[PDB]
Write a protein that binds this ligand. Structure first.
Ligand code: HEC
Ligand code: HEC
Ligand code: HEC
Ligand SMILES: C[C@H](CCC(=O)O)[C@H]1CC[C@H]2[C@@H]3CC[C@@H]4C[C@H](O)CC[C@]4(C)[C@H]3C[C@H](O)[C@]12C
Length: 71
């Protein structure tokens, strides 16, 4: 399947799946989550545990604005 881009107004955010599969071998961090996770995602999640927060705990991955958002 293809990578996805979240169409944030301030700049497109790429989600590269292969990097994540490799770096977070614990698949259950993202997969087999209960119902509602598609409807639940948004700016709060992205800037929290949905993207940024995981990067911060793992000590690797983009945490600055321009590292996620790119026109
Ligand atoms: C969040 C950070 C994820 C982690 C960790 C893993 N997966 Fe994932 N997966 C995630 C998304 C948002 C999507 C759809 C968007 C995309 O970029 O593809 C997927 C997709 C898959 C698929 C289908 C395509 C593919 O992987 O080749 C599979 C089979 C899949 N995910 C499995 C998988 C496994 C086995 C993981 C751990 C080793 C894993 N993913 C991590 C989000 C995230
Ligand atoms: C843990 C459960 C994560 C979640 C949820 C998200 N990301 Fe992530 N990401 C994670 C790690 C440990 C890393 C380092 C991987 C590396 O090889 O550097 C990453 C990396 C990225 C990257 C950069 C990929 C690269 O090739 O350097 C991007 C662009 C990225 N992550 C974006 C991203 C987004 C947009 C997420 C939410 C949709 C997201 N990540 C979630 C761990 C985790
Ligand atoms: C990845 C780890 C990110 C970092 C670091 C920052 N942002 Fe972000 N942001 C990210 C995603 C994946 C999304 C979209 C959520 C979704 O609904 O899919 C966003 C959202 C925003 C928004 C709102 C955009 C919109 O509603 O169209 C803004 C204004 C925004 N982000 C700005 C922003 C700034 C200023 C950041 C640095 C301080 C920043 N983001 C970090 C992913 C990530
Ligand atoms: C559930 C995980 C991990 C974060 C968490 O614990 O909630 C999060 C991390 C990345 C999230 C996906 C990012 C891309 C998509 C954003 C969409 O607007 C809603 C569906 C997708 C497919 C999201 C679904 C789900 O919300 C995921 C896979």
């Amino acid at each position: 399947a293809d990578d996805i881009v979240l169409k944030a107004k301030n700049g497109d955010v790429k989600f590269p799946h292969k990097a994540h599969q490799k770096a977070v071998p614990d698949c259950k961090k993202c997969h087999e989550k209960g119902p509602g996770k598609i409807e639940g995602f948004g700016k709060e999640m992205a800037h929290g545990k949905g993207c940024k927060g995981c990067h911060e705990e793992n000590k690797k991955g983009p945490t600055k604005c321009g590292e996620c958002h790119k026109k």
